[PDB]
Curated annotation (Swiss-Prot):
Catalyzed reactions per annotation: a beta-lactam + H2O = a substituted beta-amino acid
Protein name: Beta-lactamase TEM
SS bond partners: 51-97
Pfam families: Beta-lactamase2
Biotechnology: This protein is used as a marker in many commonly used cloning vectors, such as pBR322 and the pUC series.
Effect of residue 13 to K: In TEM-2, TEM-3, TEM-8, TEM-16 and TEM-24
Gene3D superfamilies the UniProt entry points to: DD-peptidase/beta-lactamase superfamily
High-level lineage: Bacteria, Pseudomonadati, Pseudomonadota, Gammaproteobacteria, Enterobacterales
Binding site for substrate: 208-210
Active site: 44, 142
Effect of residue 138 to H: In TEM-6 and TEM-16
Length: 262
């Protein structure tokens, strides 16, 4: 009971809704949940689904990881720390997904959206793999606006958790694509203070964080002891006036509890 208590206490302390899912990676069944069917802004956690859509195209031969994309300074949107450095040389599709997942690069996410035909086509990919709930409507950085009761650019905790499970371990992607997707997530460099801050030595974690307007904060992860992932955690929150530091700490404390009670 301790973890759902920490979640509810986080809601009270943040003054905001928190959505939570702890899922069994093997059976795909929910172990614990809070607000599983409520919608929350995905923010940068969508970048993992985006790269899954790109990998599905790589498997089908409609895309190639080594393909080079050139772009100009005028394509650069806010928060583009990798893409801003490859203006003369461009970046491969592989480099763009790396930048999008491991550094949350926004221009890399937009260039990859263009390769698949935009937000509506990501939404179509998700629908076709069985997720009729998640939707992407906008590009970076507008997709982080988080207007209350706006369903654009949202998931539910349950839909995101089950979809991540299908991408990492399901029948959709090739073994090589599944491994590349979780490898990018293991190399995340922008989720330091979240679940990773709770992770004991020897544990595996592959994740993707996000933040947006109006207090929006979240994380998707595959994690587990003995160097192997065994469960999927999804945590989202929106609407709080709390600082980034407090939101981070609340997520870390939910992590500490679920790890303590594994």
């Amino acid at each position: 009971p301790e973890t759902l208590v920490k979640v509810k206490d986080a809601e009270d302390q943040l003054g905001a809704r928190v959505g939570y899912i702890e899922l069994d990676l093997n059976s795909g069944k929910i172990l614990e949940s809070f607000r599983p069917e409520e919608r929350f802004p995905m923010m940068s956690t969508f970048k993992v689904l985006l790269c899954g859509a790109v990998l599905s195209r790589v498997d089908a031969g409609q895309e190639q990881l080594g393909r080079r994309i050139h772009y100009s300074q005028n394509d650069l949107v806010e928060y583009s720390p990798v893409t801003e450095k490859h203006l003369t040389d461009g970046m491969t599709v592989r480099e763009l997904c790396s930048a999008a997942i491991t550094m949350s690069d926004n221009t890399a996410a937009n260039l990859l959206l263009t390769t698949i035909g935009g937000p509506k086509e990501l939404t179509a990919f998700l629908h076709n793999m069985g997720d009729h709930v998640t939707r992407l409507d906008r590009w970076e950085p507008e997709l982080n606006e988080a207007i209350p009761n706006d369903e654009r650019d949202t998931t539910t905790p349950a839909a995101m958790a089950t979809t991540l499970r299908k991408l990492l371990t399901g029948e959709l992607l090739t073994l090589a694509s599944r491994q590349q997707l979780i490898d990018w997530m293991e190399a995340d460099k922008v989720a330091g203070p979240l679940l990773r801050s709770a992770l004991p030595a020897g544990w595996f974690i592959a994740d993707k964080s996000g933040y947006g307007e109006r207090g929006s904060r979240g994380i998707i992860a595959a994690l587990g002891p003995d160097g192997k992932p065994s469960r999927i955690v999804v945590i989202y929150t929106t609407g709080s006036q709390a600082t980034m530091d407090e939101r981070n700490r609340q997520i870390a404390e939910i992590g500490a509890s679920l790890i303590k009670h594994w």
